[PDB]
Design a protein around this ligand. Structure first.
Ligand SMILES: OC[C@H](Cc1ccccc1)Nc1ncnc2[nH]ccc12
Ligand SMILES: [Cl-]
Length: 167
């Protein structure tokens, strides 16, 4: 039993809810919140920009030190950093950004990072400003993640289409 509330159960391990991931993380304080990161951990917009704003830019400061030490992430890769005031940890995961021409096949690799954590609060990878079809992203999530994932879809209209169209 966990403290996530109001989700629809898509599968044995995948749940979905119309919610602002920022407000969800603040309420639940999950062990792991997933960020829709880029390889530079530049959290300028989308989910990343909003999560960073909620940390008063502490996420960006920590991320800049991480990049200075380690260099950029790989597309499809991840790193674990602090969750600041939002969660214990933040799993920064880089899904492909179609608006950069990045290979969409890497979306499965991106979701595989979730399997290293027993329970996660997450957005749909490569959705929003990363340019992928959120319906496809949900399918890859369900077919790749085996740990317990609580998906937050900010857009209510998009949420209804994902649920109604889910096979
Ligand atoms: O896939 C991630 C989606 C992308 C999206 C945004 C808008 C319309 C359609 C798709 N973004 C978010 N999901 C959950 N919480 C969020 N907080 C801020 C952004 C955000
Ligand atoms: Cl977005």
């Amino acid at each position: 039993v966990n403290s996530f509330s109001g989700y629809l159960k898509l599968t044995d391990n995948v749940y979905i809810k119309n919610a602002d991931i920022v407000e969800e993380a603040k309420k639940v304080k999950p062990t792991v919140v997933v960020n829709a990161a880029n390889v530079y951990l530049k959290h300028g917009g989308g989910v990343a920009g909003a999560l960073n704003k909620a940390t008063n830019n502490a996420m960006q400061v920590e991320s800049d030190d991480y990049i200075a030490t380690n260099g950029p992430l790989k597309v499809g890769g991840s790193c674990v950093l602090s969750g600041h005031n939002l969660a214990k940890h933040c799993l920064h995961v880089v899904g492909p950004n179609v608006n950069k021409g990045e290979d969409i096949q890497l979306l499965k690799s991106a979701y595989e990072n979730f399997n290293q954590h027993e329970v996660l609060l997450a957005p749909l990878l490569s959705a929003g400003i990363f340019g992928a079809d959120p319906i496809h992203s949900l399918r890859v999530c369900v077919d790749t993640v085996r740990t317990n994932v609580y998906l937050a879809v900010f857009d209510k209209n998009l949420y209804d289409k994902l649920v109604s169209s889910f096979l």
